[PDB]
Amino acid sequence: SDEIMLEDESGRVLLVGDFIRSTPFITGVVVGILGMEAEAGTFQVLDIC
Amino acid sequence: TVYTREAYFHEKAHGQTLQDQILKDQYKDQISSQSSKIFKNCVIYINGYTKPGRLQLHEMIVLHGGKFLHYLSSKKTVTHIVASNLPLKKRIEFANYKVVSPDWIVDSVKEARLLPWQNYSLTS
Amino acid sequence: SDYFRIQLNNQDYYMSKPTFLDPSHGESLPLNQFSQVPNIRVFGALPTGHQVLCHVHGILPYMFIKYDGQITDTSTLRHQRCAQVHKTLEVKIRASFKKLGNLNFVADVSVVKGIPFYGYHVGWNLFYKISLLNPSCLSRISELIRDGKIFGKKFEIYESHIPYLLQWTADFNLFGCSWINVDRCYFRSPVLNSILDIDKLTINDDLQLLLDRFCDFKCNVLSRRDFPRVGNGLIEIDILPQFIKNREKLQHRDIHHDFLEKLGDIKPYVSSARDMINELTMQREELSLKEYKEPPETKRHVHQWQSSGEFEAFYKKAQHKTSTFDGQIPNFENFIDKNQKFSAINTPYEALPQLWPRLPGLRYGKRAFVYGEPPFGYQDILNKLEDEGFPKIDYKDPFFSNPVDLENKPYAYAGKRFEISSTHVSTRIPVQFGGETVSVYNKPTFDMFSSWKYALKPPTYDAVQKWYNKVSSVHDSLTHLTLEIHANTRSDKIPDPAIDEVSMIIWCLEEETFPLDLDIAYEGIMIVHKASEDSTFPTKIQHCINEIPVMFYESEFEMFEALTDLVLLLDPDILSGFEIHNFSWGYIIERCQKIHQFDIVRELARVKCQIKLSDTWGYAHSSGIMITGRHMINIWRALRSDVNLTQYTIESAAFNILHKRLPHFSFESLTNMWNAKKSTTELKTVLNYWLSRAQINIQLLRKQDYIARNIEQARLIGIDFHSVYYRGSQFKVESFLIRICKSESFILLSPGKKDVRKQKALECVPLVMEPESAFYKSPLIVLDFQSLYPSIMIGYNYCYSTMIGRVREINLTENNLGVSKFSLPRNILALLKNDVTIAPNGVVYAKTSVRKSTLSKMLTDILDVRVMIKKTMNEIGDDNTTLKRLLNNKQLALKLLANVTYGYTSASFSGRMPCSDLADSIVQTGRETLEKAIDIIEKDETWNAKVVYGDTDSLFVYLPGKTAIEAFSIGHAMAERVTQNNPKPIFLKFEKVYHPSILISKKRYVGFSYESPSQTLPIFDAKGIETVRRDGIPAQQKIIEKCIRLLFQTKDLSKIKKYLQNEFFKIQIGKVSAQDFCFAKEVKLGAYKSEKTAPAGAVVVKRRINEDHRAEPQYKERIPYLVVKGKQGQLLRERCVSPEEFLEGENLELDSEYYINKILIPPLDRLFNLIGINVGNWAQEICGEELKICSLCDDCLEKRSTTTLSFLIKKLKRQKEYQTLKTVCRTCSYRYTSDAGIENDHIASKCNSYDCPVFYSRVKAERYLRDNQSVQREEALISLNDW
């Protein structure tokens, strides 16, 4: 898996965008993802919390 | 009832006994009281390779009295057991039993009298 | 090609009302019609890959009986007699069933000629040809006829044991899993059936061209009203026997009616072997190999037996008895009755077209004396020493590394003295001059100021440096489908087809052999999910999978209907599953039959209508559930038959074959992870779990090549796909015999059960020489005949058609031979005074010159195929290990087929055509050949070799001190000489050589085998010993193998003793994996006389059944169990600790003493008593935290700085081991979880697979951490640190 995916005990969606690409991440932590829905079943990342 | 397999061996033994009796009846050339009852009330089972070979010693055993056993199912219903070679484990298991060389039957047939197994014992 | 081709996959027969495509009249009774006629349904596949249902009409089963008439009839009384006998038989049969007309049971009777196959018959024999309308009643009618229920006399029946389908295939030259050729066919109502989208999806250009060429929509298309579609296939067709072009290609020969072979007037007898040979040659040509050839050698055989003279005298007496008084001597030309007017009658194959529908240098010195030359040389010394009486090579007997284990006791066993001496300098005898030892008697006198120097050389510089340096566009296969289920059980009770519903079904069609390339993903997931449940669940599942499309249905019934529709659309030929009895298809069938009240078996079948009773034989052996038009296999049973595993578990099988480890979770874990409102990780884990199960099963079937091997076997034998693994080998033997013998107008006897039971017993047995229990240090040459019994059949001409009778009791009135009694001609023996062969038991057999046997031809073809396969196997060395394995499997199958062909005789139990005399002669001549080979080997003075062991064909030749190099040539010479002295078909091969060999008893030997001189690493070969037996435990097998290897390599008993002591100490302490100490014995619940006589595993099975009735093991299924410690006098069956109960037991300890004694002492003693030592002596020779003998903290000496260090070291080691085990388990569970973070370690710890040692190690580590000892160590640490 070369892409970061989000889960909140209800579903899993794909996260895209250069904001989240240039940031290391480890499973078990929670962040606030903000953005707009992409053309496909993916969520764009614009700002993070 | 069901044939199964345990009764199959019993029927096979009965058929072998019947065939031996038929062969004895057919072979009437044996002299009376001579070379015909030397192996009376004696059961001989062939074990392993024998120099005369089985189905030839079998005829000598059947014609000259006694019953031939093909399967040593029970150790009580056998008097003499014939085996040219015996391993150490089988020698230990068959202790106190009369094990003789296969030449004993042919020697008794040639001599026309039952021969003791003291001299013809497999041991020593 | 120009012929319609359908691959005969499955065949079935059903009764139907007569039509104008079926014969409605009989030749014997033209005034009576047929109430019903039999029809054959064939489920075939076109070369394009599309399925097709084929209906075969006009095929009527028939049987033969003795003719009561004469050969002088004027072709008019014969018809009246046939009509009378037909009427009488029909009336009697109908009365038994409980003139009129409307024939329903017996169709027609005719008079045909033939040659009986049971015995030596030359002249033409007339036989009745009774044709039956109901094939299902063939056995009943045969039983009625054989008992004389219809006729007054007990008429013998002929050709009744052959199945209807097998008889039809043999008559029409049909082969299973092979193309059928028809010139024209009658199409059903629709040209392309469309259940849902079948017609549109499966339409292709090839089908269009085929239907345009072979159909015109004016004549081939049948009426909808009279011929509706019955099969659930794309296209259904109807044919006639005339249409089938597979016939008219057989080679019919009439040479058995007289002595044609002897008079001289006029190899691939089986057509199936040619295809296999061509395929094998094509396969071997892909590797740029050479051509195929075999150079024969001339045989100088004379072969009189032990009792040849008595048999010859009896034969002369019989010839004197059975001979006409003076008169003209019989001749081969005029022995038979010529001008017999036998041309009026018709041959059995010529009667088939009748009743058809018929549709429209250094100086010595200044003064030096030279001594005499040595008497010997470098090369002659060994020969002189051997001639002196000592072996050329003095192989070292087993010894002791140190004399402390000698014990100074006599080593003997069963009265045989054994001399064992150590190589240590303490026990080595001093060098003696002139035969007298020299030693010092006076006390040593040491002086003052004496210097001494060390003797042993130090390791060399080079050794230390070296140590540091190293350290085809045609469908020729069967479509495959796999199904698996998931059930939400309540608590821990396993799935139940009565209270538990199916929640998920996973299917994966095998894409390798699936044609038509239709629009599907080849994998699908079906899960029930009511709309009243939690929402967004389908989206979550789809996003979790994202590769395999998933279909969701509101109710279980809708899901089952969708699965049935998908099965109909794909129309797979094979339905599979690891356990299709308690799970997979069986669970779904049980659910539908119980709660849904739906007959899903009929829906899954390929026929809408016309389908009875369950078959216990199918459940016990294989393929318990039968679906019409499809073949189902119990894949776990197939793996059990193919590979010899110890658990036969999906995880265990995957690890053993595919080398993939699969974690196993309890059903409670599955039902807790499959619940709603759960994390996506759990759903992904369970979905990947089921997907991995299905894919692993598919890969297992692909790797084992079960489908391909079964298809090849069906093609070669001629039977259908199902009968290869469903029916026994007698079916294959009957098929081969019928196919071979139908070309010679042969008629086969069908004796009843009573005749087989009353047949002569089998007194003649194969020779099993008793071996000598000793350790053979010198190389042992083993010689085994290749296809000894088939070679005997080929050479001595032993077959049913070449038997004159037993040498004794021959008479011209009545003789007993096998299971039938016949009469001999007046001067048959006088005419055959030269072309006869006397069996060693006293049976006369016709020579090959006067009569060639069909069995000889069949066995010769089989042996040629096997020899070619073996040559191809030997020609490929390490190039492709899978091709070698496939060739080995094929040659094993061919050898098994030949053995079964032999075993068709001597079948006194469950035998359809047995013959005691023939099999007795075969085994007796085999024993005589073995005895002659032994005599030949022992007679030659060039080698003093004496045979010590011998199997039915194998011969163990001992070569004392032959250096193992000349042994190869010696064995080759012995094999060549024995083959030369034997007949032409009989051949003896060198096989392998046992350098180190141990002979324990009959059918039990272990040793190192050297297949070829070029081999450098010997291969461990074991037969019958506990290493290969599955009745023990893996630990004992490993211990025995290690001990045998050490004894054979180092020959030092001290190392073996030390290893055994270490293993015993480890077992007593408890540092064992607890996985290699479990037994694996199959249990048959319904095959036990009583509970007292039940096996140890039966107790565990009953205990598991008591707590839950759904845990019923399948027939012959291994049940693991262990033996925990118990009170003195307790029975072994009482404890019967299951591994699940043993591991869960808090205070359960395995019986170390019981294991160490009863699993190690007997086999090790048996393997070692031949040397002169017993392993029992070695076994018997072996308050406070620390080990102060005795001492709060339970420690006398404080030693804080050392005690706390030791405690910390032990705790750190245990913690590191536990962490490594947890990491390994997490990595393994990542396969399903697909995540390395939290909620995956919990899933990894949830695994409880009993086929993986990592789980046992983790359980042991957890027990050690939670043990009371760990608490004591912590308390001691706290007390010591309290300062």
Next chain:
DNA sequence: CCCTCCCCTAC
């Protein structure tokens, strides 16, 4: 101490 039943293997 030997027989019977069950398990397993070799041909």
Next chain:
DNA sequence: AATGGTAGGGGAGGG
């Protein structure tokens, strides 16, 4: 409801 024979050995329970 179907089953190809032969042989041989070992271990547990009851004599």
